[PDB]
Amino acid sequence: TNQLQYLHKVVMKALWKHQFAWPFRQPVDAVKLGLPDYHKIIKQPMDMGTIKRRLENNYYWAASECMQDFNTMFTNCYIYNKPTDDIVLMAQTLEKIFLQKVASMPQ
Amino acid sequence: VTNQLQYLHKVVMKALWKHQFAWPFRQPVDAVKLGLPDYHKIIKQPMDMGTIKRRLENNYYWAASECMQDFNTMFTNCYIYNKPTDDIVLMAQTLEKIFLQKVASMPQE
Ligand SMILES: Cn1c(=O)c2c(ncn2CC2OCCO2)n(C)c1=O
Ligand SMILES: Cn1c(=O)c2c(ncn2CC2OCCO2)n(C)c1=O
Numbered sequence: 001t002n003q004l005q006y007l008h009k010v011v012m013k014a015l016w017k018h019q020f021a022w023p024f025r026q027p028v029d030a031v032k033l034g035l036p037d038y039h040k041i042i043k044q045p046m047d048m049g050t051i052k053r054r055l056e057n058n059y060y061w062a063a064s065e066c067m068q069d070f071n072t073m074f075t076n077c078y079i080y081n082k083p084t085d086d087i088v089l090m091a092q093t094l095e096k097i098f099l100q101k102v103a104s105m106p107q
Numbered sequence: 108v109t110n111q112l113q114y115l116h117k118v119v120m121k122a123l124w125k126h127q128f129a130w131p132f133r134q135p136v137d138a139v140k141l142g143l144p145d146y147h148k149i150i151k152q153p154m155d156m157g158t159i160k161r162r163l164e165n166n167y168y169w170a171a172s173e174c175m176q177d178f179n180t181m182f183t184n185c186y187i188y189n190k191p192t193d194d195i196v197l198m199a200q201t202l203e204k205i206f207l208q209k210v211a212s213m214p215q216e
């Protein structure tokens with residue numbers, strides 16, 4: 001769809017290259033990051049590499065479905081991490097760009 | 108009086124305000140009433156649907172994206188402050204899904 005193309009080539013491209021994006025480009029590796037409780041707390045992991053791959057393999061039936069994946073990724077971050085962790089500020093910065101770009105998506 | 112802001116008022120706020128999970132979000136978090144002495148230490152930008160509703164009613168917003176940020180702040184405050192297992196997190200998630208679903212069909216411009 002026009003909307004899924006926009007999420008791929010306008011929204012995702014802006015977020016992917018952002019200087020705060022690196023923690024979010026691939027799944028949380030709880031073993032390599034040493035977080036034995038991550039998957040006990042976060043039951044729907046999500047990340048931009050997964051969303052990007054889904055955008056390219058025609059996984060999504062509708063724009064809102066892809067937007068929900070973006071939301072899950074950010075929400076996971078807020079739920080798991082402490083309020084003072086830098087990664088929370090990074091998610092918020094990226095999430096605001098997401099919402100800005102989504103506001104200009106074809107209707 | 109943008110089409111976008113009209114959409115956010117007549118479609119998004121209409122749906123969320125009357126939602127059965129909306130009541131904890133209809134007014135600012137009252138930290139005294141709720142017994143949350145650390146709330147304003149952790150949440151530095153409180154937001155609630157009553158504030159957003161009033162702002163839409165008084166044409167406070169210059170752009171749709173700024174109303175959208177207020178909604179986002181209100182949900183994010185909840186995810187950041189509350190424990191993962193708090194029921195309020197589930198209620199916020201349910202409301203935010205509706206918010207995103209509707210925002211996907213918002214007019215451009
Ligand atoms: C999304 N996400 C990460 O990407 C992450 C992380 N813990 C480490 N990382 C990677 C990076 O190390 C310093 C800050 O982010 N957690 C708990 C998380 O939620
Ligand atoms: C304080 N308070 C409510 O105000 C409430 C509620 N359950 C429903 N409401 C009312 C709300 O407005 C109309 C539709 O839902 N509970 C459990 C509650 O504690």
Ligand SMILES: Cn1c(=O)c2c(ncn2CC2OCCO2)n(C)c1=O
Binds near residue numbers: 143185188189
């Ligand atoms: C926004 N907000 C609330 O309104 C709230 C609350 N803790 C309780 N409440 C009220 C209600 O009790 C059961 C479900 O929510 N917290 C920490 C919060 O962030």
